[PDB]
mmCIF file of C-alpha atoms in Angstrom:
data_model
loop_
_atom_site.group_PDB
_atom_site.id
_atom_site.type_symbol
_atom_site.label_atom_id
_atom_site.label_comp_id
_atom_site.label_asym_id
_atom_site.label_seq_id
_atom_site.Cartn_x
_atom_site.Cartn_y
_atom_site.Cartn_z
ATOM 1 C CA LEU A 34 87.512 96.706 99.917
ATOM 2 C CA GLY A 35 87.617 99.863 102.013
ATOM 3 C CA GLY A 36 90.221 97.899 103.882
ATOM 4 C CA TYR A 37 91.144 94.376 102.823
ATOM 5 C CA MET A 38 94.709 93.316 102.882
ATOM 6 C CA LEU A 39 96.411 94.190 99.670
ATOM 7 C CA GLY A 40 97.358 90.785 98.447
ATOM 8 C CA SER A 41 101.093 91.293 98.487
ATOM 9 C CA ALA A 42 102.848 92.952 95.586
ATOM 10 C CA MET A 43 103.946 90.228 93.161
ATOM 11 C CA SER A 44 105.614 92.741 90.834
ATOM 12 C CA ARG A 45 104.083 90.654 88.033
ATOM 13 C CA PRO A 46 105.183 86.962 88.074
ATOM 14 C CA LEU A 47 105.472 87.263 84.341
ATOM 15 C CA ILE A 48 102.578 85.481 82.700
ATOM 16 C CA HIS A 49 104.104 85.846 79.172
ATOM 17 C CA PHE A 50 101.901 85.093 76.204
ATOM 18 C CA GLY A 51 104.757 85.383 73.765
ATOM 19 C CA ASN A 52 102.786 88.095 72.027
ATOM 20 C CA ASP A 53 103.401 91.571 70.698
ATOM 21 C CA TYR A 54 100.320 93.531 71.672
ATOM 22 C CA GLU A 55 98.305 91.144 73.899
ATOM 23 C CA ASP A 56 101.553 90.338 75.707
ATOM 24 C CA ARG A 57 102.350 93.975 75.981
ATOM 25 C CA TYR A 58 98.759 94.474 77.095
ATOM 26 C CA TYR A 59 99.450 92.204 80.039
ATOM 27 C CA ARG A 60 102.916 93.818 80.475
ATOM 28 C CA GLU A 61 101.305 97.203 80.910
ATOM 29 C CA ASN A 62 98.422 95.449 82.670
ATOM 30 C CA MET A 63 100.939 94.998 85.390
ATOM 31 C CA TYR A 64 100.717 98.770 86.026
ATOM 32 C CA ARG A 65 97.234 99.900 84.915
ATOM 33 C CA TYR A 66 96.084 96.625 86.205
ATOM 34 C CA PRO A 67 98.100 95.737 89.193
ATOM 35 C CA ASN A 68 100.247 92.935 90.450
ATOM 36 C CA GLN A 69 98.374 92.805 93.678
ATOM 37 C CA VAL A 70 94.849 92.069 94.745
ATOM 38 C CA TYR A 71 92.236 93.159 97.206
ATOM 39 C CA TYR A 72 91.363 90.634 99.884
ATOM 40 C CA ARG A 73 91.904 89.876 103.561
ATOM 41 C CA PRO A 74 94.156 87.017 104.695
ATOM 42 C CA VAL A 75 92.713 83.629 104.068
ATOM 43 C CA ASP A 76 93.398 80.120 105.239
ATOM 44 C CA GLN A 77 89.975 78.910 106.276
ATOM 45 C CA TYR A 78 88.440 77.768 102.981
ATOM 46 C CA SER A 79 88.988 75.030 100.402
ATOM 47 C CA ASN A 80 88.350 76.584 96.981
ATOM 48 C CA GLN A 81 90.975 79.046 95.796
ATOM 49 C CA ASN A 82 89.643 80.697 92.643
ATOM 50 C CA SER A 83 86.411 81.132 94.579
ATOM 51 C CA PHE A 84 87.819 83.462 97.232
ATOM 52 C CA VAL A 85 90.646 84.436 94.920
ATOM 53 C CA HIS A 86 88.876 85.353 91.666
ATOM 54 C CA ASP A 87 86.428 87.089 94.067
ATOM 55 C CA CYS A 88 89.320 89.180 95.414
ATOM 56 C CA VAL A 89 89.864 90.095 91.781
ATOM 57 C CA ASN A 90 86.145 90.714 91.383
ATOM 58 C CA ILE A 91 87.303 93.405 93.731
ATOM 59 C CA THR A 92 90.703 94.177 92.179
ATOM 60 C CA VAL A 93 90.096 94.160 88.516
ATOM 61 C CA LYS A 94 87.170 96.356 89.371
ATOM 62 C CA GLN A 95 88.940 99.197 91.031
ATOM 63 C CA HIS A 96 91.591 98.858 88.352
ATOM 64 C CA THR A 97 89.424 98.700 85.194
ATOM 65 C CA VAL A 98 86.307 100.633 86.128
ATOM 66 C CA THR A 99 88.073 103.913 86.770
ATOM 67 C CA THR A 100 91.710 102.964 86.870
ATOM 68 C CA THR A 101 91.324 101.857 83.266
ATOM 69 C CA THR A 102 88.888 104.491 82.047
ATOM 70 C CA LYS A 103 91.520 107.082 82.900
ATOM 71 C CA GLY A 104 92.651 106.745 79.335
ATOM 72 C CA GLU A 105 93.511 103.104 78.906
ATOM 73 C CA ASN A 106 92.416 100.744 76.229
ATOM 74 C CA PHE A 107 90.767 97.748 77.772
ATOM 75 C CA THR A 108 89.500 95.084 75.478
ATOM 76 C CA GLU A 109 88.263 91.526 76.134
ATOM 77 C CA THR A 110 91.970 90.748 76.057
ATOM 78 C CA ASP A 111 92.557 93.140 78.968
ATOM 79 C CA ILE A 112 89.978 91.396 80.957
ATOM 80 C CA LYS A 113 91.680 88.092 80.686
ATOM 81 C CA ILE A 114 95.311 89.220 80.999
ATOM 82 C CA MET A 115 94.293 91.213 84.014
ATOM 83 C CA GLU A 116 91.783 88.993 85.764
ATOM 84 C CA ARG A 117 93.905 86.002 84.870
ATOM 85 C CA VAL A 118 97.059 87.412 86.436
ATOM 86 C CA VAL A 119 95.462 89.233 89.290
ATOM 87 C CA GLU A 120 93.409 86.100 89.966
ATOM 88 C CA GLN A 121 96.117 83.487 89.737
ATOM 89 C CA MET A 122 98.402 85.539 91.935
ATOM 90 C CA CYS A 123 95.604 86.094 94.390
ATOM 91 C CA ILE A 124 95.624 82.328 94.165
ATOM 92 C CA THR A 125 99.403 82.312 94.535
ATOM 93 C CA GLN A 126 98.938 84.602 97.501
ATOM 94 C CA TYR A 127 96.166 82.241 98.656
ATOM 95 C CA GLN A 128 98.573 79.351 99.064
ATOM 96 C CA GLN A 129 101.079 81.911 100.310
ATOM 97 C CA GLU A 130 98.497 83.340 102.715
ATOM 98 C CA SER A 131 97.728 79.811 103.846
ATOM 99 C CA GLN A 132 101.348 79.230 104.789
ATOM 100 C CA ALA A 133 101.664 82.833 105.954
ATOM 101 C CA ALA A 134 99.090 81.760 108.515
ATOM 102 C CA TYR A 135 101.525 79.006 109.297
ATOM 103 C CA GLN A 136 104.263 81.620 109.755
ATOM 104 C CA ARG A 137 102.148 83.891 111.959
ATOM 105 C CA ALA A 138 101.012 80.804 113.843
#
């Protein structure tokens, strides 16, 4: 991910758990953990969460393996709220990227 194409900036699509702390965890996990992912622009595969959750196997990394250990509290909850959002928006930006390829076409 020395390059990649930062998978847009979704500003958090609001994933809302209707929680106090785990919600908030995600709501801060929009900053500590981002609302954008690390991947290059795709529209040449079938599976989404494959390439997508992989882009987060990049993103959540950079954002939880140093970006979190900078004084954040990441628990199993953080993993999900973060991977889940960052993944499903990498997925959102997968279908977006797909059609973005249609726009650049």
